[PDB]
Amino acid sequence: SEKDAKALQFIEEMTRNADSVQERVLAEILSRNGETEYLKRFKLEGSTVRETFKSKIPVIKYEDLQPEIQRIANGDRSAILSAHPISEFLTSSGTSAGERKLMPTIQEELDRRQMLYSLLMPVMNLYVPGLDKGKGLYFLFVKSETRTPGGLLARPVLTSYYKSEHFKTRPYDPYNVYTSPNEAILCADSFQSMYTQMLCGIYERKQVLRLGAVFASGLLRAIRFLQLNWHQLTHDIRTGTLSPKITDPSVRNCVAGVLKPDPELADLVAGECSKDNWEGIITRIWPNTKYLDVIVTGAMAQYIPTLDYYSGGLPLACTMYASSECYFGLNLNPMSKPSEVSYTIMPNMAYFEFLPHEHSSIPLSRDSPPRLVDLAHVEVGKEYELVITTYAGLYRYRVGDILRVTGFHNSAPQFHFVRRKNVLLSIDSDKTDEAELQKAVDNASKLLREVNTSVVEYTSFADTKTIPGHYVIYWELLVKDSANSPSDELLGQCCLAMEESLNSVYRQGRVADNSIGPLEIRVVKSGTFEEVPRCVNPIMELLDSRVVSSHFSPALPHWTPARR
Numbered sequence: 021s022e023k024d025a026k027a028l029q030f031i032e033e034m035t036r037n038a039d040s041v042q043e044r045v046l047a048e049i050l051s052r053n054g055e056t057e058y059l060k061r062f063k064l065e066g067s068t069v070r071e072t073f074k075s076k077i078p079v080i081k082y083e084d085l086q087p088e089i090q091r092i093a094n095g096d097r098s099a100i101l102s103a104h105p106i107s108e109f110l111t112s113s114g115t116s117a118g119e120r121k122l123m124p125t126i127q128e129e130l131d132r133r134q135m136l137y138s139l140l141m142p143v144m145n146l147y148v149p150g151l152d153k154g155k156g157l158y159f160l161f162v163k164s165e166t167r168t169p170g171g172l173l174a175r176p177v178l179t180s181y182y183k184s185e186h187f188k189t190r191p192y193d194p195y196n197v198y199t200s201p202n203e204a205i206l207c208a209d210s211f212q213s214m215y216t217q218m219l220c221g222i223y224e225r226k227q228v229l230r231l232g233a234v235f236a237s238g239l240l241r242a243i244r245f246l247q248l249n250w251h252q253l254t255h256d257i258r259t260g261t262l263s264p265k266i267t268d269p270s271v272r273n274c275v276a277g278v279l280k281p282d283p284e285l286a287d288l289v290a291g292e293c294s295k296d297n298w299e300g301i302i303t304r305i306w307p308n309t310k311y312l313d314v315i316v317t318g319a320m321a322q323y324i325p326t327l328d329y330y331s332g333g334l335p336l337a338c339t340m341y342a343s344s345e346c347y348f349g350l351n352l353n354p355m356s357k358p359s360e361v362s363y364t365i366m367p368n369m370a371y372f373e374f375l376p377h378e379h380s381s382i383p384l385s386r387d388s389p390p391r392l393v394d395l396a397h398v399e400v401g402k403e404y405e406l407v408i409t410t411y412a413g414l415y416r417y418r419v420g421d422i423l424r425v426t427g428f429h430n431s432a433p434q435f436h437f438v439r440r441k442n443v444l445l446s447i448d449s450d451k452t453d454e455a456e457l458q459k460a461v462d463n464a465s466k467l468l469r470e471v472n473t474s475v476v477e478y479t480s481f482a483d484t485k486t487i488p489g490h491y492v493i494y495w496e497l498l499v500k501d502s503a504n505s506p507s508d509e510l511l512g513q514c515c516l517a518m519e520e521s522l523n524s525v526y527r528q529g530r531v532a533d534n535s536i537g538p539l540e541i542r543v544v545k546s547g548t549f550e551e552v553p554r555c556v557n558p559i560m561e562l563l564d565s566r567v568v569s570s571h572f573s574p575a576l577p578h579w580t581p582a583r584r
């Protein structure tokens with residue numbers, strides 16, 4: 021098609037001209053934002069070229085920018101980071117001091133995100149044909165918002181995007197017709213949103229040509245939801261009535277097109293769900309599904325076998341590489357094997373620099389900043405920390421992502437995603453690091469003072485046998501008086517104290533949308549460790565063989581949308 025051709029040509033043009041496009045993007049940023057408080061701090065003297073930018077503007081982490089960001093949060097509306105007003109903060113799933121990081125954005129950034137989204141289907145159509153003959157079943161969700169003292173909205177980037185006009189009144193695309201109505205996606209009640217997205221997907225089962233969600237965990241949560249709610253769902257289809265549990269009238273209305281008594285379909289679906297073996301169930305309920313559109317690169321790799329199990333070995337497409345700070349780029353070959361996925365950073369999105377991995381763990385100098393390596397000049401096989409300069413006022417901002425160059429498409433590098441720095445445990449969007457986990461152990465261990473017990477040793481892993489997944493922590497204890505050992509009731513309170521100690525995103529996954537299961541402490545017999553922490557990353561079976569008792573957190577930890 022003509023629209024696809026234009027989009028592919030855009031890729032070619034951006035990729036052939038990577039270095040000059042990068043140059044222009046920076047010049048635009050520096051021309052517009054030249055007068056900002058932050059830039060004028062480093063005597064840029066109006067210069068809009070790479071070389072003075074590199075030698076004067078420090079390379080920073082989130083903490084470095086907090087003075088400027090807090091002032092904006094607290095209502096200072098002057099040109100501090102951007103010439104344009106900061107339209108809102110996009111809350112990263114990555115945290116600082118336990119709280120989601122506030123990433124500044126501006127209004128026109130939405131156009132760039134939309135631009136990147138518009139490239140995905142033209143690329144996909146090359147590899148998978150006939151996607152216009154049907155629909156996608158995607159499970160997409162908004163998350164809660166809050167406002168900063170100065171009145172700025174603070175919410176996840178996906179929420180900001182789903183609730184924007186670029187999504188709600190998105191351009192028509194016959195290769196991108198979703199089963200889920202906007203009102204389901206936009207519904208603030210996760211149960212109702214999931215419920216109706218599933219119902220619509222079941223009603224339109226035969227038109228379904230792909231299943232998806234942003235993350236692998238999201239799609240698994242959907243499959244588990246069906247496992248747990250197919251009784252009510254099938255009753256609804258049979259009767260052509262919508263469960264009273266759906267109280268949001270706007271959501272009640274969006275389902276009206278499909279809600280028709282269909283006993284045949286209700287019997288087919290219950291026929292499949294009542295089986296105790298769910299291997300391949302995806303292609304029995306949705307028999308025309310060609311692939312699963314779900315991120316399985318990075319931390320989500322852990323989910324590939326569970327996905328293959330339910331899908332019967334269907335291809336997995338990882339489409340996009342993006343963040344709260346900046347949408348990065350796309351996968352020019354969506355049909356490649358998960359372990360061989362490369363992402364091509366799109367040079368129109370921001371100004372991208374790279375810090376060689378081997379230099380990334382030593383403090384950088386503010387008065388003499390490193391040159392870094394430009395997007396066009398990275399070397400195949402080398403590893404880098406991603407560094408960004410955005411239109412919204414992030415200047416030489418270290419994302420924390422390690423990337424490995426695997427090749428080039430024209431002049432644009434392609435990147436294998438290695439990892440987000442210092443992330444030990446993750447189930448869904450939660451990212452828990454060594455320090456948070458350590459302080460979490462210390463907190464729960466003090467609760468053991470009611471006996472003579474202390475924690476001699478610990479390790480962890482993210483357990484994905486269960487949906488939702490959960491953190492498992494292995495505890496070697498030291499009980500001075502065997503007669504006064506700690507009980508199941510107390511060790512459960514040790515679990516909940518650990519959870520209480522973890523970051524906002526963890527606690528939210530427990531509370532808001534059921535995307536993280538209860539944290540589990542496994543008490544190992546004395547002396548187990550000797551034969552390395554604080555995480556396992558087989559080996560767990562060896563540890564499990566020595567497990568005396570296992571304890572699950574009994575209640576939900578504290579979480580509200582409000583920030584500290």
Ligand SMILES: Nc1ncnc2c1ncn2[C@@H]1O[C@@H](OP(=O)(O)OCCc2c[nH]c3ccccc23)[C@H](O)[C@H]1O
Nearest residue numbers: 112113114177315317318340341342343344421437440
């Ligand atoms: N394809 C990928 N494979 C491994 N890891 C990936 C990854 N894409 C991102 N990440 C990690 O997520 C980012 O975090 P964040 O919460 O800000 O955004 C949520 C993601 C997000 C927000 N809109 C989107 C639109 C499309 C795809 C992903 C997103 C971190 O940079 C990065 O390490």
